[PDB]
């Protein structure tokens, strides 16, 4: 019974619905559309700012939590990778603030925002490393608590940030929500005595670095595929139409992201450890089929329900100025069902750690997204983007099942 994990997931979702509502009421579709590319860079940083080794951290930590020698080597090497990547991340941010603003916003008017992120992304990397540490020690309480306080102080940080700074303040606030988690995490890691601070001194173990490097390569492939895909599609969509039109399509994604993460909580905690243990083919197919028999009707019931109250959903989580999303709801929710269905095939590849299959999965989604947007974005606009999102994951789900039965019969 992992009630700590569900509680922190609930608090995180409630805060996201909050700040998302405030961002939509204060800045309307133009704000939700313009901030969409910036919110993308944040999630990538949470995936990569600390070299993206955190899942490799919590794994090898549990492996060697009983060997004080090997436990110090894994944490000291992980702290070394976080520190070096964070410093390199600060340098590229301060040296390329204008080109990043260009690729993200279309204008270089956000130079100061990207440069300040160089300091903010350090709180991303260290906060994530401290949380991954508490995970590998089976400290679900200290992790969930640090996540609860961090999300609360985030909402506090977002309010004062947007009230003082306006729109850019709201953008900086969004950066402070996952960054300010360093303070509760550090307090919980140290005051609880789960590990002495001497273990965090940066050392280098050649072997453990290479294993965590494969985790870094995986997050790198994750970062330069689907994230840069969505950015180009919102830039092409804001070039033919308005940034207000971007906020119309981004709003339906923001609503669907509410229930999807509580659904994915039934994945990483229960699915991923299972597929890694079992080996036989017949055993693997049985676990993929049973997860599909759960998550596919689960996401379909939630999707159909938000479609049934799409008028209420827009009025509740966003503003009435977002009334034009009602017709994009149907097309996006079908793609959501198929994306979550293809999630079980991706979590199999993650368990296999096949960088070949992961590359193929992300490249296939990026390519399908690009071609379908180029055909539908200039014609139908924001609706054409939702039509794209569905049609890729129609082909993606179909293709994923085909390569599964091929790989099941030793292709």
């Amino acid at each position, epitope marked *: 019974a992992s009630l700590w994990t569900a509680a922190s997931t609930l608090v995180k979702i409630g805060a996201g619905l909050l700040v998302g509502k405030l961002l939509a009421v*204060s*800045f309307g579709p133009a*704000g939700l559309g313009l901030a969409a590319n910036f919110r993308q860079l944040i999630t990538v940083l949470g995936v990569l700012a600390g070299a993206g080794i955190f899942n490799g951290v919590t794994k090898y930590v549990a492996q060697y939590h009983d060997n004080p020698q090997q436990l110090r080597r894994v944490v000291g090497t992980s702290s070394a990778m976080v520190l070096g990547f964070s410093t390199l991340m600060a340098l590229v941010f301060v040296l390329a603030a204008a080109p990043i603003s260009q690729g993200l916003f279309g204008n270089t008017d956000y130079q100061g925002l990207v440069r300040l992120v160089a300091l903010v992304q350090m709180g991303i990397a260290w906060g994530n490393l401290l949380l991954a540490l508490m995970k590998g020690f089976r400290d679900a309480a200290g992790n969930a608590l640090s996540l609860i306080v961090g999300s609360l102080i985030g909402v506090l940080a977002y309010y004062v940030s947007y*009230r003082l*700074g*306006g*729109y*850019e303040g709201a953008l900086l606030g969004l950066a402070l929500i996952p960054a300010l988690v360093v303070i509760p995490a550090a307090i919980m890691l140290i005051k609880r005595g789960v590990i002495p601070l001497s273990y965090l001194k940066p050392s280098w173990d050649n072997g453990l670095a290479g294993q965590l490097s494969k985790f870094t390569l995986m997050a790198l492939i994750t970062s330069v595929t689907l994230p840069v895909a969505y950015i180009m599609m919102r830039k092409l969509l804001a070039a033919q139409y308005s940034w207000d039109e971007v906020g119309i399509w981004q709003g339906v994604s923001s609503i669907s992201d509410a229930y999807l993460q509580f659904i994915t909580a039934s994945f990483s905690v229960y699915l991923l450890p299972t597929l890694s243990r079992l080996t036989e083919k017949r055993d693997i197919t049985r676990e993929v089929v049973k997860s599909l028999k759960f998550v596919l009707p689960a996401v379909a019931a939630a999707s159909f329900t938000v479609w049934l109250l799409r008028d209420f959903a827009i009025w509740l989580l966003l503003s009435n100025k977002f009334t034009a999303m009602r017709d994009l709801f149907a097309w996006q929710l079908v793609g959501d069902v198929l994306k979550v269905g293809a999630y079980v095939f991706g979590y199999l590849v993650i368990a296999k750690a096949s960088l070949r299959f992961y590359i193929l999965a992300e490249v296939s989604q990026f390519t399908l997204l690009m071609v379908f947007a180029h055909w539908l974005i200039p014609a139908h606009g924001a609706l054409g983007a939702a039509q794209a999102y569905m049609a890729t994951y129609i082909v993606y789900f179909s293709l994923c099942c085909g390569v599964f039965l091929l790989w099941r019969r030793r292709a």
Partner: nanobody
Framework: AQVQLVESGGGLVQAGGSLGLSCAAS????????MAWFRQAPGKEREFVAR????????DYADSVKGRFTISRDNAKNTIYLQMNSLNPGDTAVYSC?????????????????????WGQGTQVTVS
């Protein structure tokens, strides 16, 4: 592309001489927007020149132009004006007028260009 802006005027001018700038807005409810003027030199970032409030016509100017520049608005014609009086050669830049709602400005972010989503194509002002 909700509120589109079109600049007009500017060009060549001798040092010390004057020049007027005008920006026209094709959008609904022009009297609710925060209008501002921004200039930009080749290779530099967009800098704040002047802004006018959406309420009582309150104005704000940069430390560079205060006294020499004067911004004004006319909600009836959906246009804003910028009268530039004393002109040093350092004022050579592409001047752009921008629109934004008061919630985007916040409290201290009235002079930041990233707080203005809707822009104009800008006009070239060159001070000999």
């Amino acid at each position: 592309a909700q509120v589109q802006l079109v600049e007009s005027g500017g060009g060549l001018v001798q040092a010390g001489g004057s020049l007027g700038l005008s920006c026209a807005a094709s959008g609904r409810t022009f009297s609710n927007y925060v209008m501002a003027w921004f200039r930009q030199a080749p290779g530099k970032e967009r800098e704040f020149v002047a802004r006018i409030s959406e309420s009582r016509g309150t104005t704000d100017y940069a430390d560079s132009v205060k006294g020499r520049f004067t911004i004004s608005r006319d909600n009836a014609k959906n246009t804003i004006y910028l009268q530039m009086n004393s002109l040093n050669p350092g004022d050579t830049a592409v001047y752009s007028c921008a629109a934004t709602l008061p919630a985007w400005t916040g409290i201290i972010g009235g002079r930041r260009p990233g707080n203005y989503p809707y822009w104009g194509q800008g006009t070239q002002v060159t001070v000999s």
